[PDB]
């Protein structure tokens with residue numbers, strides 16, 4: 115995350131972190147239930163064997179609230195394409211159930227119609243992760259969050275050098291130096307409604323980080339609510 | 349603005365218009381209160397809430 119601020123104690127409990135063989139984070143995820151994680155399809159080709167860490171806010175030290183879970187089943191959308199990044203979504207089933215606690219809790223899945231008319235018409239959403247704090251820097255050792263304005267669909271289309279499909283949406287700033295970045299992919303985009311946070315997107319891609327005339331591109335969760343429900347049963 | 353378009357129909361969470369009337373509902377892990385509008389967490393760590401303990 116470029117700009118924004120630190121997630122303070124208990125503020126981002128749905129954040130998950132995918133860690134490689136060296137125990138280093140390479141992507142994010144969203145906790146949906148005791149057995150399921152939401153992530154990006156493109157994150158699956160960034161490591162061979164990986165696990166999931168929950169409850170962490172500072173990767174420099176183990177304070178005691180962190181827990182690691184192995185992945186039982188990887189459910190990747192069969193329509194994902196590296197060429198356009200369309201259908202950038204995956205669901206992970208864990209071997210053991212997550213223990214909800216301070217800094218560990220699921221985000222709410224909304225219903226499709228209501229989410230589109232009421233959540234996605236709000237002024238902003240919240241993106242979070244352990245990714246880079248600048249386009250060329252190293253990954254953040256602290257979990258960060260950032261408020262990002264929803265961006266008009268037409269304006270986003272005009273600004274992009276790659277096709278913006280109906281399975282995607284745009285959020286962030288034209289020129290202001292705040293955006294998601296490398297390592298944040300797969301993580302949560304949530305929208306607050308009366309002190310309750312609902313998952314509205316998955317961190318997907320951007321032409322670099324926080325560039326002028328450029329926005330952040332997120333997988334549109336509402337397009338995949340039935341698919342998610344089906345993945346959480348089978 | 350009428351029904352679900354006027355302040356979310358007074359609902360805490362989901363709002364639906366059924367036969368020209370407001371109907372509220374809640375996410376999994378909440379139950380609708382007796383007033384038919386508020387959403388009550390059924391147990392510990394309900395979805396979408398920042399943790400306090």
Ligand SMILES: C[C@@H](C(=O)N1CCC[C@H](N)C1)N1CC[C@H](NS(=O)(=O)c2ccc3cc(Cl)ccc3c2)C1=O
Pocket residue numbers: 196197198199276293294295296297298299317318319320321322323324329330331332
């Ligand atoms: C255009 C796209 C790319 O190479 N693509 C996507 C279009 C299709 C093409 N085949 C691959 N790119 C360019 C490099 C960039 N990688 S990044 O690590 O800087 C990155 C990753 C995810 C991001 C998410 C948000 Cl919301 C904002 C900024 C981000 C920056 C990246 O993703």
Ligand SMILES: [Ca+2]
Pocket residue numbers: 170171172173174175176177180
């Ligand atoms: Ca830690």
Ligand SMILES: [Mg+2]
Pocket residue numbers: 286287288289290324325326327328329
């Ligand atoms: Mg910009």
